């Protein structure tokens, strides 16, 4: 019932294979219907099929001829059907198959050799079936198989007598999760021709049983091992012992309630490159806990440590030098924890660390000092995240060790202080500083004089004060390109605040009180603080209380692409106020008191616009006031979202719900 070289007939209550469709289709989705059998005759005309998805039906068995009728079929999906008896003929003629999907069919056992014919098959999925064993054949077959999926079955042993039918196969993925294994009988993994990835997640295993598995994995091509939610209560120098004789490069131990990590627990993994330890209950990370992991370049310790119970030093504890062995560690994540604080050698020895995320990693980092991040002095850290740590004061030279740091996020903290500008000393290559969402930030003229390379500076909702200095606090930032000064109730801006920032591209000033500075009656004249901003592309002035616009505030912004002044009190605008906005592609006056979209004002702006939004306005349905706008609406190609429902006329009394586009 839907087609574009792909016949989508999904969810149509179909009890019959459509004979309507064109005979040149190559994909046929028949999922979620009441089909109970696929007689090969009804597939004779659809011979060009390469994908046949017929999941979610009442199909009981397949006649052999079905395959003969589709000799190009490469993807067959019979998942979530009643297909529970497999014979030697069910797939015998489906030879060009590369994916066979047989999930959720109450398949309790497999008899002889259903798959011996599928020599091209790459992926076999038999998950969510009552399979009590991995026996799929009585001979070596499926040498081209790469993905064997048997998760979510009743399989409780791995025996070489059943997996050696893969002795010519190189399995990239052997998914055995959510199975209740209790024994890894000897040789079982060397049975497979090559075993690259093994997945045992939600497999209730335990520390001693896990030890055996690794011994069985010894001398295998294993590269990916995933023991997530394995109930690994603890580890020991003995656990991953067999992994000594592997080149394993990925290990997942997340969601294990991992309580104690013995020393050298992971000493046997010198080729490991990716370590996923998140979501555990580690009590104490001793010195030698991570000894040996000298090739790991990505560690993840998110929520890895225990949570503060009632505080009687129920906090975690990370001894110094605990990371000194990870020499290649490029990317460390420790976010969402209760580490009490940064000790003087916490991060010592991480000579390749580039990205470190410490978001909410701590109980509280109350004060950053010139001692705090000293252990990082010898790493090339480029990105440092310190959000959600209740940081309250930053002192001089606090980041002096982070020489090559480029991005620094201090947002979502409780920082209340005066930025003397000493703080940023040392930051020689800094490009972004996020200070949004803090308690109080009081500016000086040198608040950023030590960081001229700065390109992004975010000051959202910090009750900013002293932005109105004689040379603005931002004057030394001559390559600033994004400045966010929103939600600061800024009532006084000086004329020359953005002077010098010739490169400024995005300026967010929404939710301030700088409304009177553009009234004609301002003591001294309106403040033209946007002058000289050639490269400005985005300007957001929402919720500022504006109700006048001076005729030439936007006179220099020729590259302005998005202008955003809604949720103001604007009713009438000076004619030719938008004249110089030639690249303007998005104009927004969404909630204002506008009644009169006159051509003399909006003409040049509307000229070429990608999108316009001036909804919810008290439009006056009179020719002098709305007429030319209505014509432009019916004519223009610029799209006007919610046009017929949220552009409503309010005057005169006789036109009140009339959507403005109808007269």
């Amino acid at each position, epitope marked *: 019932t839907v087609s574009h070289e792909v016949a989508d007939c999904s969810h149509l209550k179909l009890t019959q294979v459509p004979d309507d469709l064109p005979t040149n289709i190559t994909v046929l989705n028949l999922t979620h219907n009441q089909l109970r059998r696929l007689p090969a005759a009804n597939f004779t005309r659809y011979s060009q099929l390469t994908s046949l998805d017929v999941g979610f039906n009442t199909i009981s068995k397949l006649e052999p001829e079905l395959c003969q009728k589709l000799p190009m079929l490469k993807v067959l999906n019979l998942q979530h059907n009643e297909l529970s008896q497999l*014979s*030697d*003929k069910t797939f*015998a003629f489906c030879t060009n198959l590369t994916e066979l999907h047989l999930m959720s069919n109450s398949i309790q056992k497999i*008899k*002889n*050799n259903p798959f*011996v*014919k599928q020599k091209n098959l790459i992926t076999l999925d038999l998950s969510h079936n009552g399979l009590s064993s991995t026996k799929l054949g*009585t*001979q*070596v*077959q499926l040498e081209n198989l790469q993905e064997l999926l048997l998760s979510n079955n009743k399989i409780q042993a791995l025996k*070489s*007598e059943e997996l*050696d*039918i893969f*002795a010519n196969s190189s399995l990239k993925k052997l998914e055995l999760s959510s199975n209740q294994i209790k024994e890894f009988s000897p*040789g079982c993994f*060397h*049975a497979i021709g090559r075993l690259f990835g093994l997945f045992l997640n939600n497999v209730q295993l335990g520390p001693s049983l896990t030890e055996k598995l690794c011994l069985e994995l010894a001398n295998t091509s294993i590269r990916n091992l995933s023991l997530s939610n394995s109930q690994l209560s603890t580890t020991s120098n003995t656990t991953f012992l067999g992994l000594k004789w592997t080149n394993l490069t990925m290990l997942d131990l997340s969601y294990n309630n991992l309580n104690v990590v013995g020393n050298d627990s992971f000493a046997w993994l010198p080729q490991l490159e990716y370590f996923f330890l998140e979501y555990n209950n580690i009590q104490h990370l001793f010195s030698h806990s991570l000894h040996g992991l000298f090739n790991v370049r990505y560690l993840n310790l998110k929520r890895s440590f225990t949570k503060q119970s009632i505080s009687l030093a129920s906090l975690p504890k990370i001894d110094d030098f605990s990371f000194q062995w990870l020499k290649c560690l490029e990317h460390l994540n420790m976010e969402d924890n209760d580490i009490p604080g940064i000790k003087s050698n916490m991060f010592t020895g991480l000579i390749n660390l580039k990205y470190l995320s410490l978001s909410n990693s701590f109980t509280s980092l109350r004060t950053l000092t010139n001692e705090t991040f000293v252990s990082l002095a010898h790493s090339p850290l480029h990105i440092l995240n310190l959000t959600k740590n209740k940081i309250s004061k930053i002192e001089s030279d606090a980041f002096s060790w982070l020489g090559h740091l480029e991005v620094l996020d201090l947002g979502l903290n409780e920082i209340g202080q005066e930025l003397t500008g000493q703080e940023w000393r040392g930051l020689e290559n800094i490009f972004e500083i996020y200070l949004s969402y803090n308690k109080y930030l009081q500016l000086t003229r040198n608040s950023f004089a030590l960081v001229p390379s700065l390109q992004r500076l975010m000051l959202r909702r910090v009750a900013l004060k002293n932005v109105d200095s004689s040379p603005s606090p931002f004057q030394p930032l001559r390559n600033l390109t994004i400045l966010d000064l929103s939600n600061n109730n800024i009532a006084n801006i000086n004329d020359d605040m953005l002077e010098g920032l010739e490169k400024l591209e995005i300026l967010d000033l929404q939710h301030n009180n700088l409304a009177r500075l553009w009234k004609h009656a301002n003591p001294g004249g309106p403040i033209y603080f946007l002058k000289g901003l050639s490269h400005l592309h985005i300007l957001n002035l929402e919720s500022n209380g504006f109700d006048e616009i001076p005729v030439e505030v936007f006179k220099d912004l020729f590259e302005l692409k998005i202008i955003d002044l809604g949720l103001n009190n604007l009713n009438t605008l000076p004619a030719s106020v938008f004249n110089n906005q030639v690249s303007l592609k998005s104009l927004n006056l969404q909630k204002n008191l506008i009644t009169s979209v006159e051509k003399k004002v909006f003409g040049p702006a509307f000229r070429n616009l990608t999108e316009l939004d001036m909804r919810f306005n008290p439009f006056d349905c009179t020719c002098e006031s709305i007429a030319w706008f209505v014509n432009w609406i019916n004519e223009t190609h610029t799209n006007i979202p919610e046009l017929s429902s949220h552009y409503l006329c309010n005057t005169p009394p006789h036109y009140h719900g009339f959507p403005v586009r109808l007269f």
Partner: antibody
Amino acid sequence: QVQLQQSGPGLVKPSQTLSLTCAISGDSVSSNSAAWGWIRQSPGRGLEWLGIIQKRSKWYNNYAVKVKSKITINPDTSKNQFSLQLSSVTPEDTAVYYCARYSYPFYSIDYWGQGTLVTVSS
Amino acid sequence: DIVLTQPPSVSVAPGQTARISCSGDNIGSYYVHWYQQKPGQAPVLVIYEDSERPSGIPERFSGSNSGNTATLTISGTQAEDEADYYCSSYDDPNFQVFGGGTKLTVK
């Protein structure tokens, strides 16, 4: 071409052990694409199955129930031949014995042995 | 399980067509083989995987497998074709299952 050649005592006394030998030529016993076994035929036409051996990572041998306690088939790579043995034979075991090459996928028997009559009589 | 069952005897006038049937609960779900055994001789595979012959078996021999019956068909019967015929398949414990055999007679 491949061909199977039996050899062994055709007179065996009761309670004793029947022992035969299939000698292959034109094919390896350790080869893939096939398994090796035995088929017995009592003179009253009954053509019945005994057991087979086959190799995947190791050698496995699946015998028929009814001889599952007496039969022993196993290969001999050094000579390229496999063997049949039955212990405590009764006169019921008097029959014609064929060695056989079952071939994969579905265990069809392309090539048979010449047959060797073995009689269990005192 | 699976129990192959074929007729005791069948005769054929030489030159005519012989068919020997092999019934069984869902035999169509299996691949069937056919063995020809002449008096005092090891059998010979004539049809395997139930449909096409091996190398050197003549084209006169042919088989099918549908529903609950599988048939070996021998067009243009010659005098030599007089033999016993067995159908076979394999189920997991027993790697060869045999029918009763059919004794084919020719004038």
